[PDB]
CSV table of N, CA and C and ligand atoms in Angstrom, one decimal:
chain,number,residue,atom,x,y,z
A,1,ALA,N,106.5,78.8,99.1
A,1,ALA,CA,105.3,78.1,99.8
A,1,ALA,C,104.7,77.1,98.8
A,2,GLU,N,103.4,76.9,98.8
A,2,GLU,CA,102.8,75.8,97.9
A,2,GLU,C,103.1,76.0,96.4
A,3,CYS,N,103.3,77.3,96.0
A,3,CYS,CA,103.4,77.6,94.5
A,3,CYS,C,104.9,77.9,94.2
A,4,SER,N,105.8,77.3,94.9
A,4,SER,CA,107.2,77.3,94.5
A,4,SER,C,107.9,76.0,94.7
A,5,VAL,N,109.1,75.8,94.1
A,5,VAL,CA,109.9,74.6,94.3
A,5,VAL,C,111.4,75.0,94.2
A,6,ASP,N,112.2,74.4,95.0
A,6,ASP,CA,113.6,74.6,94.9
A,6,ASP,C,114.3,73.4,94.1
A,7,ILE,N,115.2,73.8,93.2
A,7,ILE,CA,115.9,72.7,92.5
A,7,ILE,C,117.3,73.0,92.4
A,8,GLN,N,118.1,72.0,92.5
A,8,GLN,CA,119.6,72.1,92.4
A,8,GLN,C,120.1,71.4,91.2
A,9,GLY,N,121.1,72.0,90.6
A,9,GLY,CA,121.9,71.4,89.5
A,9,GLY,C,123.4,71.3,90.0
A,10,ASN,N,124.0,70.2,90.0
A,10,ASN,CA,125.3,70.0,90.6
A,10,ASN,C,126.5,69.9,89.6
A,11,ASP,N,127.7,69.7,90.1
A,11,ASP,CA,128.9,69.5,89.1
A,11,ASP,C,128.8,68.2,88.3
A,12,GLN,N,128.0,67.2,88.7
A,12,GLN,CA,127.9,66.0,88.0
A,12,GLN,C,126.7,65.9,87.0
A,13,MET,N,126.2,67.1,86.6
A,13,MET,CA,125.1,67.1,85.6
A,13,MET,C,123.8,66.4,86.1
A,14,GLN,N,123.5,66.6,87.3
A,14,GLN,CA,122.3,66.1,88.0
A,14,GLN,C,121.4,67.2,88.5
A,15,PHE,N,120.1,67.1,88.2
A,15,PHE,CA,119.1,67.8,88.9
A,15,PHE,C,118.7,66.9,90.1
A,16,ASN,N,118.3,67.5,91.2
A,16,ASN,CA,117.9,66.7,92.4
A,16,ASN,C,116.5,66.2,92.4
A,17,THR,N,115.8,66.5,91.4
A,17,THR,CA,114.4,65.8,91.2
A,17,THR,C,114.2,65.6,89.7
A,18,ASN,N,113.4,64.6,89.3
A,18,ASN,CA,113.0,64.4,87.9
A,18,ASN,C,111.5,64.6,87.7
A,19,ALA,N,110.8,65.1,88.7
A,19,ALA,CA,109.3,65.3,88.7
A,19,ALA,C,108.9,66.5,89.6
A,20,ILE,N,108.2,67.5,88.9
A,20,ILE,CA,107.7,68.6,89.6
A,20,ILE,C,106.1,68.5,89.5
A,21,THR,N,105.5,68.7,90.6
A,21,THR,CA,104.0,68.8,90.7
A,21,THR,C,103.6,70.3,91.0
A,22,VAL,N,102.7,70.8,90.2
A,22,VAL,CA,102.2,72.2,90.4
A,22,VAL,C,100.7,72.1,90.7
A,23,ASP,N,100.3,72.6,91.9
A,23,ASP,CA,98.9,72.7,92.3
A,23,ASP,C,98.2,73.5,91.2
A,24,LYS,N,97.2,72.9,90.6
A,24,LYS,CA,96.5,73.6,89.4
A,24,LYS,C,95.8,74.9,89.8
A,25,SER,N,95.6,75.1,91.1
A,25,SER,CA,94.9,76.3,91.6
A,25,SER,C,95.9,77.5,91.8
A,26,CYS,N,97.3,77.2,91.8
A,26,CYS,CA,98.2,78.3,91.9
A,26,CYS,C,98.1,79.3,90.7
A,27,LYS,N,98.1,80.6,91.0
A,27,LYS,CA,98.0,81.6,89.9
A,27,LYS,C,99.4,81.7,89.2
A,28,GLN,N,100.4,81.6,90.0
A,28,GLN,CA,101.8,81.7,89.4
A,28,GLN,C,102.6,80.5,90.1
A,29,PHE,N,103.8,80.2,89.5
A,29,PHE,CA,104.6,79.2,90.1
A,29,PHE,C,106.0,79.7,89.9
A,30,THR,N,106.8,79.4,90.9
A,30,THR,CA,108.2,79.9,91.0
A,30,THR,C,109.2,78.7,91.2
A,31,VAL,N,110.3,78.7,90.4
A,31,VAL,CA,111.3,77.7,90.5
A,31,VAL,C,112.6,78.5,91.0
A,32,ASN,N,113.1,78.0,92.1
A,32,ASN,CA,114.3,78.6,92.7
A,32,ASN,C,115.5,77.7,92.4
A,33,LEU,N,116.3,78.1,91.4
A,33,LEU,CA,117.4,77.3,91.0
A,33,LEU,C,118.7,77.7,91.7
A,34,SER,N,119.5,76.6,92.1
A,34,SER,CA,120.8,76.9,92.7
A,34,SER,C,121.8,75.8,92.1
A,35,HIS,N,123.1,76.0,92.4
A,35,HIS,CA,124.1,75.2,91.8
A,35,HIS,C,125.2,74.8,92.9
A,36,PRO,N,125.0,73.7,93.6
A,36,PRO,CA,126.1,73.2,94.5
A,36,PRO,C,127.3,72.8,93.6
A,37,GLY,N,128.5,72.7,94.2
A,37,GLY,CA,129.7,72.4,93.5
A,37,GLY,C,130.6,73.6,93.3
A,38,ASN,N,131.7,73.5,92.5
A,38,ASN,CA,132.6,74.6,92.4
A,38,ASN,C,132.9,74.9,90.9
A,39,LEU,N,132.2,74.3,90.0
A,39,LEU,CA,132.6,74.5,88.6
A,39,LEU,C,131.9,75.8,88.1
A,40,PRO,N,132.7,76.6,87.3
A,40,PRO,CA,132.2,77.9,86.8
A,40,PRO,C,131.2,77.8,85.7
A,41,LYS,N,130.5,78.9,85.4
A,41,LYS,CA,129.4,78.9,84.5
A,41,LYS,C,129.8,78.4,83.1
A,42,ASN,N,131.0,78.8,82.7
A,42,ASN,CA,131.5,78.5,81.3
A,42,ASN,C,131.9,77.0,81.2
A,43,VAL,N,131.9,76.2,82.3
A,43,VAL,CA,132.2,74.8,82.2
A,43,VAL,C,131.0,73.9,82.6
A,44,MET,N,130.2,74.4,83.6
A,44,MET,CA,129.1,73.6,84.1
A,44,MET,C,127.9,74.5,84.5
A,45,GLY,N,127.6,75.5,83.7
A,45,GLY,CA,126.4,76.3,83.9
A,45,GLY,C,125.2,75.4,83.7
A,46,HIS,N,124.2,75.7,84.6
A,46,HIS,CA,122.9,75.0,84.4
A,46,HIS,C,121.8,76.1,84.2
A,47,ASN,N,120.8,75.7,83.5
A,47,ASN,CA,119.5,76.5,83.6
A,47,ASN,C,118.4,75.5,83.9
A,48,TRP,N,117.2,76.1,84.1
A,48,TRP,CA,115.9,75.3,84.2
A,48,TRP,C,115.0,75.9,83.1
A,49,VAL,N,114.6,75.0,82.2
A,49,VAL,CA,113.8,75.4,81.0
A,49,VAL,C,112.5,74.5,81.0
A,50,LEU,N,111.4,75.2,80.7
A,50,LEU,CA,110.1,74.5,80.6
A,50,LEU,C,109.5,74.6,79.2
A,51,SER,N,109.0,73.5,78.7
A,51,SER,CA,108.3,73.4,77.4
A,51,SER,C,107.3,72.2,77.4
A,52,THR,N,106.4,72.1,76.4
A,52,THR,CA,105.7,70.9,76.2
A,52,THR,C,106.7,69.8,75.9
A,53,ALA,N,106.3,68.5,76.2
A,53,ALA,CA,107.1,67.4,75.9
A,53,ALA,C,107.5,67.4,74.4
A,54,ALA,N,106.5,67.7,73.5
A,54,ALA,CA,106.7,67.7,72.1
A,54,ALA,C,107.8,68.7,71.6
A,55,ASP,N,107.8,69.9,72.3
A,55,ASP,CA,108.7,71.0,71.9
A,55,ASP,C,110.1,70.8,72.5
A,56,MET,N,110.3,69.9,73.4
A,56,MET,CA,111.6,69.8,74.1
A,56,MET,C,112.8,69.6,73.1
A,57,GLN,N,112.6,68.7,72.2
A,57,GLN,CA,113.7,68.3,71.3
A,57,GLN,C,114.2,69.6,70.5
A,58,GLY,N,113.3,70.3,69.9
A,58,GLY,CA,113.6,71.5,69.1
A,58,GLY,C,114.3,72.6,70.0
A,59,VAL,N,113.7,72.8,71.2
A,59,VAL,CA,114.2,73.8,72.1
A,59,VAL,C,115.7,73.4,72.5
A,60,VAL,N,115.9,72.2,72.8
A,60,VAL,CA,117.3,71.7,73.1
A,60,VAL,C,118.2,71.8,71.9
A,61,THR,N,117.8,71.3,70.8
A,61,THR,CA,118.6,71.4,69.6
A,61,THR,C,119.1,72.9,69.3
A,62,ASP,N,118.2,73.8,69.2
A,62,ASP,CA,118.5,75.2,68.9
A,62,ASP,C,119.2,75.9,70.1
A,63,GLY,N,118.8,75.5,71.3
A,63,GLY,CA,119.4,76.1,72.5
A,63,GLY,C,120.8,75.7,72.7
A,64,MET,N,121.2,74.4,72.6
A,64,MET,CA,122.6,74.1,72.8
A,64,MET,C,123.4,74.6,71.6
A,65,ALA,N,122.9,74.9,70.4
A,65,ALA,CA,123.6,75.6,69.3
A,65,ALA,C,123.9,77.1,69.6
A,66,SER,N,123.2,77.7,70.5
A,66,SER,CA,123.1,79.2,70.7
A,66,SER,C,124.3,79.7,71.5
A,67,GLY,N,125.1,78.9,72.1
A,67,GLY,CA,126.3,79.3,72.9
A,67,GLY,C,126.1,79.9,74.3
A,68,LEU,N,127.2,79.9,75.0
A,68,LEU,CA,127.2,80.4,76.4
A,68,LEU,C,126.6,81.8,76.5
A,69,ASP,N,127.0,82.6,75.5
A,69,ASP,CA,126.6,84.0,75.6
A,69,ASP,C,125.1,84.3,75.4
A,70,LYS,N,124.4,83.3,74.9
A,70,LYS,CA,122.9,83.3,74.8
A,70,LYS,C,122.2,82.4,75.8
A,71,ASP,N,122.9,82.0,76.9
A,71,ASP,CA,122.4,81.1,77.9
A,71,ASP,C,121.9,79.7,77.3
A,72,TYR,N,122.5,79.4,76.1
A,72,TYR,CA,122.1,78.1,75.4
A,72,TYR,C,120.6,78.0,75.2
A,73,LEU,N,120.0,79.2,74.8
A,73,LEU,CA,118.6,79.2,74.4
A,73,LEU,C,118.5,80.0,73.1
A,74,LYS,N,117.7,79.5,72.2
A,74,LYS,CA,117.5,80.3,71.0
A,74,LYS,C,116.7,81.6,71.4
A,75,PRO,N,117.3,82.8,71.0
A,75,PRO,CA,116.6,84.0,71.4
A,75,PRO,C,115.2,84.0,70.9
A,76,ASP,N,114.2,84.4,71.8
A,76,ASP,CA,112.8,84.6,71.3
A,76,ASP,C,112.2,83.3,71.0
A,77,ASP,N,112.7,82.2,71.6
A,77,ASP,CA,112.1,80.9,71.3
A,77,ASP,C,110.6,80.8,71.9
A,78,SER,N,109.6,80.8,71.1
A,78,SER,CA,108.2,80.8,71.6
A,78,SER,C,107.8,79.5,72.3
A,79,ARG,N,108.6,78.5,72.1
A,79,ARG,CA,108.3,77.2,72.7
A,79,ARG,C,108.7,77.1,74.2
A,80,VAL,N,109.6,78.0,74.6
A,80,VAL,CA,110.0,78.0,75.9
A,80,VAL,C,109.0,78.8,76.8
A,81,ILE,N,108.2,78.0,77.6
A,81,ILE,CA,107.1,78.6,78.4
A,81,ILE,C,107.7,79.5,79.5
A,82,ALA,N,108.9,79.1,80.1
A,82,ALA,CA,109.6,79.8,81.1
A,82,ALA,C,111.0,79.3,81.2
A,83,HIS,N,111.9,80.1,81.7
A,83,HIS,CA,113.3,79.6,81.9
A,83,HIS,C,114.0,80.5,82.9
A,84,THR,N,114.9,80.0,83.7
A,84,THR,CA,115.8,80.7,84.6
A,84,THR,C,116.9,81.2,83.6
A,85,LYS,N,117.8,82.1,84.2
A,85,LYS,CA,119.0,82.3,83.5
A,85,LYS,C,120.0,81.1,83.7
A,86,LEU,N,121.1,81.1,83.0
A,86,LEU,CA,122.1,80.1,83.1
A,86,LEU,C,123.0,80.5,84.4
A,87,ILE,N,123.2,79.6,85.3
A,87,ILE,CA,124.0,79.9,86.5
A,87,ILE,C,125.2,78.9,86.7
A,88,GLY,N,126.3,79.5,87.2
A,88,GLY,CA,127.4,78.7,87.7
A,88,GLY,C,127.3,78.3,89.1
A,89,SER,N,128.3,77.5,89.6
A,89,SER,CA,128.3,77.1,91.0
A,89,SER,C,128.2,78.4,92.0
A,90,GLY,N,127.5,78.2,93.0
A,90,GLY,CA,127.4,79.2,94.1
A,90,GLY,C,126.4,80.3,93.7
A,91,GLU,N,125.8,80.2,92.5
A,91,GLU,CA,124.9,81.2,92.1
A,91,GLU,C,123.5,80.7,92.3
A,92,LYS,N,122.5,81.7,92.2
A,92,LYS,CA,121.1,81.3,92.4
A,92,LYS,C,120.3,82.2,91.4
A,93,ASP,N,119.2,81.6,90.9
A,93,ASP,CA,118.2,82.4,90.1
A,93,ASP,C,116.8,81.8,90.2
A,94,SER,N,115.8,82.7,90.1
A,94,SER,CA,114.4,82.2,90.2
A,94,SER,C,113.7,82.7,89.0
A,95,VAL,N,112.7,81.9,88.5
A,95,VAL,CA,111.8,82.2,87.5
A,95,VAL,C,110.4,82.1,88.0
A,96,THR,N,109.5,83.0,87.7
A,96,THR,CA,108.1,82.9,88.0
A,96,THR,C,107.3,82.9,86.7
A,97,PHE,N,106.3,82.1,86.5
A,97,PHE,CA,105.5,82.0,85.4
A,97,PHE,C,104.0,81.8,85.7
A,98,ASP,N,103.2,82.1,84.8
A,98,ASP,CA,101.7,82.1,84.9
A,98,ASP,C,101.2,80.7,84.7
A,99,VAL,N,100.6,80.1,85.8
A,99,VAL,CA,100.1,78.8,85.7
A,99,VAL,C,98.9,78.6,84.7
A,100,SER,N,98.3,79.7,84.3
A,100,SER,CA,97.3,79.7,83.2
A,100,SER,C,98.0,79.4,81.8
A,101,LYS,N,99.3,79.5,81.7
A,101,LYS,CA,100.0,79.1,80.5
A,101,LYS,C,99.9,77.5,80.4
A,102,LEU,N,99.3,76.9,81.4
A,102,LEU,CA,99.4,75.4,81.5
A,102,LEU,C,98.1,74.7,81.6
A,103,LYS,N,98.1,73.6,80.9
A,103,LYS,CA,96.8,72.8,80.7
A,103,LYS,C,96.8,71.5,81.6
A,104,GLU,N,95.8,71.4,82.4
A,104,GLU,CA,95.5,70.1,83.0
A,104,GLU,C,95.4,69.1,81.9
A,105,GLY,N,96.1,67.9,82.1
A,105,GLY,CA,96.1,66.9,81.1
A,105,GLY,C,97.2,67.0,80.1
A,106,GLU,N,97.9,68.1,79.9
A,106,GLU,CA,99.1,68.3,79.1
A,106,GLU,C,100.4,67.8,79.8
A,107,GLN,N,101.3,67.4,78.9
A,107,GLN,CA,102.6,66.7,79.3
A,107,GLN,C,103.7,67.8,79.1
A,108,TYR,N,104.2,68.2,80.3
A,108,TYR,CA,105.3,69.2,80.3
A,108,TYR,C,106.6,68.6,80.7
A,109,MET,N,107.7,69.1,80.2
A,109,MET,CA,109.0,68.7,80.5
A,109,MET,C,109.9,69.9,80.9
A,110,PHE,N,110.6,69.7,82.0
A,110,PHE,CA,111.7,70.7,82.3
A,110,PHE,C,113.0,70.1,82.0
A,111,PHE,N,114.0,70.9,81.7
A,111,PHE,CA,115.3,70.3,81.3
A,111,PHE,C,116.3,71.4,81.3
A,112,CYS,N,117.6,71.0,81.1
A,112,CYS,CA,118.7,71.9,81.2
A,112,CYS,C,119.3,71.9,79.8
A,113,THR,N,119.4,73.1,79.1
A,113,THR,CA,119.8,73.1,77.6
A,113,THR,C,121.3,73.2,77.3
A,114,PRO,N,122.2,73.4,78.3
A,114,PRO,CA,123.6,73.4,77.8
A,114,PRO,C,124.1,72.1,77.2
A,115,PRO,N,125.1,72.2,76.3
A,115,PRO,CA,125.7,71.1,75.6
A,115,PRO,C,125.9,69.9,76.5
A,116,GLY,N,125.4,68.8,76.1
A,116,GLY,CA,125.6,67.5,76.9
A,116,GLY,C,124.7,67.4,78.1
A,117,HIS,N,123.9,68.4,78.4
A,117,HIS,CA,123.1,68.3,79.7
A,117,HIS,C,121.7,67.8,79.6
A,118,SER,N,121.0,68.0,78.5
A,118,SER,CA,119.5,67.8,78.4
A,118,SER,C,119.1,66.3,78.7
A,119,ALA,N,119.9,65.3,78.2
A,119,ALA,CA,119.4,63.9,78.4
A,119,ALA,C,119.7,63.5,79.8
A,120,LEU,N,120.5,64.2,80.5
A,120,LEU,CA,120.9,63.8,81.9
A,120,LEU,C,120.2,64.7,82.9
A,121,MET,N,119.5,65.7,82.4
A,121,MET,CA,119.0,66.7,83.3
A,121,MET,C,117.6,67.2,82.8
A,122,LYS,N,116.6,66.4,83.1
A,122,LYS,CA,115.3,66.6,82.6
A,122,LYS,C,114.3,65.9,83.6
A,123,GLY,N,113.0,66.3,83.4
A,123,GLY,CA,112.0,65.7,84.2
A,123,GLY,C,110.6,66.2,83.7
A,124,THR,N,109.6,65.7,84.4
A,124,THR,CA,108.3,66.1,84.1
A,124,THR,C,107.8,67.2,85.0
A,125,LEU,N,106.8,68.0,84.4
A,125,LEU,CA,106.1,69.0,85.2
A,125,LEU,C,104.6,68.7,84.9
A,126,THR,N,103.9,68.5,86.0
A,126,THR,CA,102.5,68.2,85.8
A,126,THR,C,101.6,69.0,86.9
A,127,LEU,N,100.4,69.3,86.4
A,127,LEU,CA,99.4,70.0,87.2
A,127,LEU,C,98.6,68.9,88.0
A,128,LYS,N,98.3,69.2,89.3
A,128,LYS,CA,97.5,68.3,90.0
A,128,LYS,C,96.5,69.1,90.8
B,201,LIG,CU1,122.8,71.5,83.3
């Protein structure tokens, strides 16, 4: 409903949006991730990861170093506000997070941390 969004990551390393708006009055927000295409998780897995704009570079750097078996996220990374699991084609995953983790006026970025994906698969998340 109002406090959720569906996003897709395809075989061409594209998310189907580059901007998410979250109603600032939502208590929680949910992202429903899916993966059109046929490529398996070990070739073209995608996740959806949320951080401040400022933290994205470090999250990406350490995440893509962490390997497939760690969903390309540094374990226990405090900079990651929320994240789905890593999914392959035909799979689905949702994450819910607390909209109080988030500041009106702050610059948020969502992105996909697997090797080669982050520059091609990112966008803004903003409260309205
Ligand atoms: Cu991706």
